[PDB]
Amino acid sequence: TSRGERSFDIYSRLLKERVIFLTGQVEDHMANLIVAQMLFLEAENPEKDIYLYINSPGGVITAGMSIYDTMQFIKPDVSTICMGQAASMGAFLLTAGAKGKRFCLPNSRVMIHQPLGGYQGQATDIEIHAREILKVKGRMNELMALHTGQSLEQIERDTERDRFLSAPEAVEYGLVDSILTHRN
Amino acid sequence: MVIEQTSRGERSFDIYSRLLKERVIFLTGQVEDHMANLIVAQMLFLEAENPEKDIYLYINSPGGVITAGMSIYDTMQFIKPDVSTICMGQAASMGAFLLTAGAKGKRFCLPNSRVMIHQPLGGYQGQATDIEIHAREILKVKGRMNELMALHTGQSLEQIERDTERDRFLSAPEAVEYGLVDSILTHRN
Amino acid sequence: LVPMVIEQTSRGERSFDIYSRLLKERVIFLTGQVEDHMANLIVAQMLFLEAENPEKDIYLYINSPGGVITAGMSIYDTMQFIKPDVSTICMGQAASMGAFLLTAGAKGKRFCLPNSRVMIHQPLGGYQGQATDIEIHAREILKVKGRMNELMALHTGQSLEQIERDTERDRFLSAPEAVEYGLVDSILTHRN
Amino acid sequence: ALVPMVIEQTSRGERSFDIYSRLLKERVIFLTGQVEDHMANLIVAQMLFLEAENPEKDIYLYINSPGGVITAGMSIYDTMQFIKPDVSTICMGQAASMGAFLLTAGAKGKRFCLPNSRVMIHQPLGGYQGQATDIEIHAREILKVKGRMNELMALHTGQSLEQIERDTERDRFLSAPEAVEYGLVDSILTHRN
Amino acid sequence: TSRGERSFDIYSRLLKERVIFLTGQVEDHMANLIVAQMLFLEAENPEKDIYLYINSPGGVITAGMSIYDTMQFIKPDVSTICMGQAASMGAFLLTAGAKGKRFCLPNSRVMIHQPLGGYQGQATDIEIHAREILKVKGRMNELMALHTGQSLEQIERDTERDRFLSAPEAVEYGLVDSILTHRN
Amino acid sequence: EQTSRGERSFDIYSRLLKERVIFLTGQVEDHMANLIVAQMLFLEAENPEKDIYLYINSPGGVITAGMSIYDTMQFIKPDVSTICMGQAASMGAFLLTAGAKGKRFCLPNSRVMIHQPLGGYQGQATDIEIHAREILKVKGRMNELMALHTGQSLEQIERDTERDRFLSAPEAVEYGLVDSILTHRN
Amino acid sequence: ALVPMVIEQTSRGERSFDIYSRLLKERVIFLTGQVEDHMANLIVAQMLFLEAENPEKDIYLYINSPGGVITAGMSIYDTMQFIKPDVSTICMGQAASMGAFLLTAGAKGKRFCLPNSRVMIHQPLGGYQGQATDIEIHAREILKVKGRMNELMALHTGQSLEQIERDTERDRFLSAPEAVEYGLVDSILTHRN
Amino acid sequence: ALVPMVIEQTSRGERSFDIYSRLLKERVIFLTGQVEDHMANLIVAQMLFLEAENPEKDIYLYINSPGGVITAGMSIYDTMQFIKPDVSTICMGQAASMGAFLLTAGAKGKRFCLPNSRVMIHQPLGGYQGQATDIEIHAREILKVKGRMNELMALHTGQSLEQIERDTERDRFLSAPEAVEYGLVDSILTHRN
Amino acid sequence: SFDIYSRLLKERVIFLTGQVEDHMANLIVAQMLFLEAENPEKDIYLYINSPGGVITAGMSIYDTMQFIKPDVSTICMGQAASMGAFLLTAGAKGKRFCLPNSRVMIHQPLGGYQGQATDIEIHAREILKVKGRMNELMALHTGQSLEQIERDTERDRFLSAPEAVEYGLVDSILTHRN
Amino acid sequence: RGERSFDIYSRLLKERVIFLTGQVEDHMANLIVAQMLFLEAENPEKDIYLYINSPGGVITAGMSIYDTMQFIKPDVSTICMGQAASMGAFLLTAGAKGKRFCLPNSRVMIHQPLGGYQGQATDIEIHAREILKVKGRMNELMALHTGQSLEQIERDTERDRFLSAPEAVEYGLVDSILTHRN
C-alpha cells in the first residue's frame, strides 16, 4: 500500500517535501491532479522551489497546456527532472521548467515531434478544424523556440519527423540545463 | 457462395440481363468501387453493340464514394451514345450528380421521386502536415463538383455554392425548375 | 428460388425456378420488408412484362410488414406509369408501405383473401446532428407525410381529414373492414 | 450431400432435375421447419403452379413443423382454400401450433397422420413495447386473432368452440390415434396399399 | 488516472479555500457534485467569492444549466478561470461567471457552436422534439448575447458552425474579462 | 467536482443532509429510490416538524420505484419542498408536482416534460390481456393524481399527456405543476 | 451473382457469357480495388492468356485502385514488361500508390487519364516486431525497396531521381492535366473519336 | 462472376473453361499465397494430371508466396521429384521460406526469377505446450526437420552445408541477381523471345 | 493500522514483483527517495522476482539507484529475467545476491514499429543505440568484456545461481540466515 | 462476502499462522514471503505454521516461497487441508522435518513440469533444454525431502499420481496425520 509511520500514502509524504510526479499519458484528470498539487504547494509557501519528476510518452495537448500555464503563473520556480523518458508533450513540459533548473538523469531520453489529430465531417467543417490545428502547431513551435534558445526555423525543421535525443544531446540542444548523476 | 437471390434461369440468367439486351442499366444502392465498375463495363459493352442508340440509366441511390461515381460520370461523357437518366425513389448526393449529368434533354424524374444535394464529406487522421495536404485536396474536389453542377443545371457557380452548403431537398417539379432534370415522366404514351 | 420447374424432359424448353415460371403467368411477388434491392427487382419485372405485352393485366401478390418509403415509391410510380393495369392481392398481411402499395392497384382490381389483415399508420424516421440540420430533415418528413396522406385519400375515396385522423396511431382492418374503408374492392374466396 | 440430382429413365430430353423438383412433378409439396414469410411464399407459389398445370388433380402437402408466424401461415391457409384442387395433408414427425392448424385445414376426408407422428395445439403468442395507448391497440388485435383461430379450428375438427377454447389455454399434446378421435385428421396412414 | 497525488483529500483541501474544479465531459452526476459544493460554500460564508476552474470539451445541456442557474442563484460571486480548454457548454459556463471576474490563462482556447441532438420515432413526435431543440438554441443565443454584450444577430452568425477563439480573442469578444499571466 | 469530504469523515452529500437537503439525480430505479426513502425517514426522525428540500434533475424512470418515493413524501410529517434544476421529465416531473403546495419551485432555465406510461411484455394472449389491463389502470391513477396536484381537470390532463409535452419554467407555473420560480437568494 | 450475363437470343441455348469475360474477348482487363496476391494472380493470368491468343495486338488495363501490397503489384509490373503485347493503361476514378505506379508503367505513349480522374503518389509503408538484430534486417530491406521503386518511377516519367524522391516523401495529389505534365500519363481522353 | 472464363458452349465441341483451367491446358500451374494442406493438394493433383496427359513434356510452376506449413510444402516437393516431367519454376512477386525452397527445387537449368522479384530464406518456426517429456519429443523433431531442409537446400543450390546453415539462422533477403549468384535460380527472365 | 508492505518499508525493504511498467516503477522510485530522506547512509534492500518489461520504465529505477546516496543491495528470488536481470546486476558491488534455486535470463532488446519507410529508419536506429548502451552497462557491472556480453546476449541465455556468481552477475548465494 | 472483523487473517498472523490458498503466482507468493520475513523479525526462534490448500501454479513463483522457507531462522510447519497438488505438494513436503502434516481427508497429487514456447528452432532448443533442467532439479529436491531415491521419484512423476493422507505418510511426503485437537 505504501504509508509508513510518517504521514499517509507514500505520494502524500513526498508532496510534503514539495515533490510531484507526472507519470504515464497526459489527459484531463491526471493533469488536473497535478494542477491541484501545484496550487496547494504555492499556498503553503510561495517562495520555495517545487520539483516535478517526469516519465511520460506524452498525451492530450490541451490537458498538457493546463499544466504549462499553471507552472508559469504561480510564484515558486518549478524545477523539472526527466527520468525514464520525456516524449512529445512530456518533452514540452520538461523544457518549460525554470531556466537553470531543468535536469535529465544519465540514461533517460527525450523525443520531440509535431501535433497529431483527426476529424470527420463536411468539407467546410474540415477546413475549420484543419486551420485550428495548424495554429496550435505554430504556437507550440514558438514556445519551444523560446525555451530552448533555438531558432524558430530549426524547431520546425526538427519536429516534422520524430527526433530522439540522449541526455547529453538534450543539454547541447538547450532542452535541459544539465545532467544529474550522483547526489551532492 | 455468392450465387443467391437474383437467379432465374439455369442459376445464372436473371431479370437484369434480360433488360440489358434492351439497353437498360440500373444504378441502385450506395455508390462504391465494385458496383461502379459493373456499371462502367455495361456502358462499354452497349457502346460496342451499337454506338448510335441511346442507353437508359435508372437511378435509385443515397450516394456514396466520390471517386467511384466519377468513374461513371467520365465514362458517360466519353462514349458515343447518349445516356438518358431516370430518377425513381431517390437520387441523393453523388446520385443526384449522376442524374443531372445525363444527356441534355433526356433527364427525367418520376412524379413522386425526390432529389437531395449537398457538399463533400470526408475524414483524416495523422500528423498536422498530412492533415493539411488532405484537407486542401477535399476543398479542390468541392470546387470541381460545384463547377460541373453549374455547367449541367445552367445555374451560376455562386448560386450552386449557396444551395449546397447544407442538405437541400427538391421535389420532382422543383428539380425541373432548377435545371436538374428536363421533365417529369407520368404515364407512358 | 430452389425448385427447378420443368417438364418430364419430353422435349420442351430451358429450366427455370418457380418464380420465373409464374412470371410467364404475369405474376409478381412482393414479400418481406420493403428495401432498395428487392424493390428494384420488382420494378425490373414490371418493365419486362410491359414490354412483353402492354395490354394484359399484371398481378402483384403482397405479404409485407412494410419498409423504406423511397423504395416503396419507386414501385408505386412504376405501377402508375406502365400501360398495363396492375391488379393487387393481399395474402397474409399488408402493413404500412405494404398497405399503401395494395391500395394503389387499378380501380376495381384490388383484393384481400378472407383471413388477410391490413394495418395503416404514419411515417417513421430519425436524425442526429446540429439543430439547423435537424430542422431541414424534420421539415422534409412532414412533407413526405403530407403527400402520402394525399395519395391515400385519392385511392380510397376517403377525405384527407379522415385519412390524417386514422393514421396518427396504428389501425388494423380485417378483410371486410378494408372493403368498407375503400382500401380494396372486394374479397377473393374460391377460384373465380 | 446438398441436393441429390436424378436424371435417368423417366427423362430423355432435358436435364436438370433436383430431388424436390422431381417430386413436385408428381404434385408433392414439403412444408418443413419454422413457418415464416419466405418459405411460406415458396409453398404458395408451388400450389399456384400445380393448379395452373392441372386444376382437378389433388395436391399432397407433407408437414413436419414446430410452427411459426401466424400471418405467414394464413397466407398458406387462404391459398389452400382458394385454389380449385383439393389439398391432402400428411403429418410426419410433428405438426405443432401453426403446423397443426395447417394439417387440420386440409380437404375433408384427406387429412392424415403417420403412426408415430405427434401433434400439439395451443393459443397465440406475442409481445409489444411502447406507450400505453399503443399497447391497448396491439393487445386488442391479438385477442381478435385468437378468437378467429379458435373459430376456424372448431369448424375443421367438428368440436364446439367452447371445447377448443378450453383445450388450447395451455399446451396440449395428441398422439396419432388421439388426433383422429379429436377430429384433427381423418385417419392414420400405416402401409402403402 | 495517475495512481497517486490526492490520497488524503487534495480537492477537499482546496475546497476549504473556496476553489472548485469542473473537468472533463459535463453530465448529471459530475454536475450535481459541483452544485453541492457551491451550496456548501454559500452556507459557510455567503459573502466571499468562489473560484471555478474550467477544463472541459462540453456535454449535456440540461446538466450544464443546473450549474448555470445555481451560479446565478447563490449570494456569493462566482469567478471563472479557463485552463486548457473550454468548449461548448464549457465555454457557456465560462462566460456566465461574475462580471469583471471571468479569466483565461495565456494559452487556453475556447470554441463555441450550436446545439446537437437526435431523435427517432413517428413524424408527429419528431416535430415535437425538433421544435424543442430549436427553442433551446434560441435561449442559449440570448444568454450568450447578454453575457458577452454582443448583439443577438452577431451571436447567431458566429455560432452556426464551430468557431475557435484564442485567449486574446476571447477578451476582445467579451467572453472573458481579462487574461491571467503571472501571480502578483 | 471531486470532493471526498466537506470535512474529512463527511462527504459533500452527508454535510448537506445535515441541512435537510436531499438530491434525486439521474434515472429513477429501485436502489437509488430506496436511498431517497431512507434519507426521508431519517430526517423525519431528527425533527418531524421542519421542512425537507428535495432537488430534482431527472429524465424519469421506473414507475413503481417512483411511487415508493411519492407515497413516502405524503406519509411523513414534514412538508417536502421540491426544486427542479436542469430538467424534470416523466416520473421526475410527477415527483416535482407532488411536493407540498406552495413549496414547489423551478429554477429560471429548467424544463419539464410530461407524457403517458411506457411498457412492454411477451407471452400467451391470456397473459398479455392481464398485463395490458394493468398498465391501463396505472395510467388512469397517474392522470387522476396529476389532476389533483395541478388543479387541472382530468379531461385536460388526459389530452395533454397522450404525447410528449415540454414546458418552460414560466409555463409550468401557469399550468400548476409548480408554485413559482427562484432566481436570486433572499 | 450480382453480375449480368451476356446472351444473344433465345435460340434454344445459344451463348452464355459474363460481362467481364465478354470484354476480355476484346482484350480489356479491369484492375479494381485494393492490390493483393489473389486479385493480382488473376490479372497475371488474363495477360498471359491474351498474349497466347495473339502476341501482337495491344492490351487495355483499366485502373481504379487505392493501391495495396508491393510484392503483389510487382508481379503485375514484371508481367506487363515481359509479355510481347504493349499494355495500354487508362485511369478512371483514381490511381493511388501501387495503382499509380502501375498506371505509369504502361507502354510509352499509351497511358491515359479520364478528365476528372485523380492520381496520388507517396512512399512505401511497413512494420515489424522482434529482436533488435532482426529489426535491422527488415528496415534495411524496406529502404532498398524504396530506392528501387523511386528509380523505376524516374525511368517511366522522365523526372530526375531527385525530383521523385522529393515529391514522394509525403502524399502528393495530381489532377489529370497535372499528371500529363508530370509525365505520369501521356494524354487525357475526353470523347470517343 | 469473379474468375473470368473463355470458350462457351458451342456446336459439338463445347467445353467451357475458366481462366486457370485454360492455362492448365498449356501445362501451367500457379502456386499463390500461404502454403497449406488443401491448396497444396490441388497443386499435387494438377501435377499428376499433367504427367498422365503427357509424361515427357515440361510443366511450369509460377510461384508468388510468403511460405507456410512445412509438411504441406513437402508434399509438393516430393511430387515434383517423383513424376517423370521436368518441373520448371518461375518466381513473380516474392518467394519466401517454403516458397523459396520450392523455387530452388525446380529442374536444374530451368529455374527463373523476374527482374524485380524478391527471395527470402530462414530456419523452421514452431511451438508446443505440454509436459516436459512431450516437449523434448517435439523439440527433437523440429531440429531434425531443420537439418533435413538445410541438407536439401545445399543439394539444390550447390552451396556447402556449412554456408547454408550460417545464412539461415536469421532472415536473409536476396534480389534476383543475388539469387542467381547464390545458386537459388539459374537466370533472370526480362523480355519474352 | 498498517499493511504488511508498509511494515517492511520501515525496515528499508522494497519489493519489485511482476512485469516492469511505468506506474509500478514509479512506486519503486518513490520508495527509494523516501528511504533516502529518512536516512541517506543506511543500505536499502531491493527484492526482485520479475520476467522483465518496459525498458524506459526500468531505466528510471536504474538511474535512481545510482543517484541516491545509500547503497542498494539486490536479492533475486524466483527469477530475474531481462530488465529484471539488468536491475539485479546494477546493485552495489559486493551486495548483490541470488537465493539457491533462483534463475536468471539475459537477452537483447525487443521492439517494433509501423509506418512510412522514413520513420521506420529513425526508430530502427534508436533501438540499435539502446542495444549498445545496455551492453556497455552490463559489461561494466559484471566485469566481462564488451565483446563477451555481445556474444552472450544475441539469443536468450539462462544462468543458474552458481553460474550467475561465476559470470559476475551477482556477488554470492544466500542459503541460511547468518 | 469476505473480510471479517476487518482482517480475521491479520489476527491469525498474530498467532504465527499463514494461509496459502488457490493458484500459485507472483503476487500471492510475494505476500507469503513478506509474511514470513515479518514473523522472523517478530521472533526468530518460534515456529511458523503454513496451511496449504492449492492446485499448484507457476514454478518460479513457488520457488521464491521454497527458498524463503529454508533461509529464515524459524522452522516452518506445513499443514495440508483440502488438497496439495503440483507446486502445492512440493511446498508441503518442504516443511521442517517432523513438522509436516495432512488432515484425514485431504489429498495430494504429484507430476512433472508443464510449459510451452513458440519461435525459431534455435530458440525452441534453448527453452526446451531449460525446462528439462528444471525438471531434474525439482526431482532432486523431492528425493531429498521424502527420503525416496531419485529414480523412484522420476518414475512416479511421469504421469499424475494421487495419494491419500495415509499414502502420503508412507511415501515420506508428510510426517503424520492430524485428527483431533491435541
PDB file of C-alpha atoms in Angstrom, chain A residues 161, chain B residues 130, chain G residues 121-123 146 150 163-172, chain I residues 116-119:
ATOM      1  CA  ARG A 161       9.552  13.854 -38.126  1.00  0.00           C
TER       2      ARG A 161
ATOM      3  CA  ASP B 130      -0.525  15.454 -43.616  1.00  0.00           C
TER       4      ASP B 130
ATOM      5  CA  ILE G 121       1.862   9.183 -55.015  1.00  0.00           C
ATOM      6  CA  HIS G 122       3.878   8.529 -51.845  1.00  0.00           C
ATOM      7  CA  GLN G 123       6.495   6.193 -50.284  1.00  0.00           C
ATOM      8  CA  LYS G 146      12.054   2.334 -51.521  1.00  0.00           C
ATOM      9  CA  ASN G 150      11.951   5.532 -56.956  1.00  0.00           C
ATOM     10  CA  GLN G 163      12.556  15.127 -58.020  1.00  0.00           C
ATOM     11  CA  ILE G 164      10.808  11.762 -57.492  1.00  0.00           C
ATOM     12  CA  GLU G 165      12.276  11.291 -54.007  1.00  0.00           C
ATOM     13  CA  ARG G 166      11.304  14.827 -53.084  1.00  0.00           C
ATOM     14  CA  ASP G 167       7.768  14.514 -54.419  1.00  0.00           C
ATOM     15  CA  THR G 168       7.105  11.182 -52.632  1.00  0.00           C
ATOM     16  CA  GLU G 169       8.284  11.696 -49.008  1.00  0.00           C
ATOM     17  CA  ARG G 170       4.655  12.628 -48.266  1.00  0.00           C
ATOM     18  CA  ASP G 171       1.311  12.174 -50.052  1.00  0.00           C
ATOM     19  CA  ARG G 172       1.083  14.237 -53.242  1.00  0.00           C
TER      20      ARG G 172
ATOM     21  CA  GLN I 116       6.470   5.195 -43.628  1.00  0.00           C
ATOM     22  CA  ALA I 117       9.960   3.964 -44.553  1.00  0.00           C
ATOM     23  CA  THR I 118      11.439   7.273 -43.451  1.00  0.00           C
ATOM     24  CA  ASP I 119      10.069   6.927 -39.894  1.00  0.00           C
TER      25      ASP I 119
END
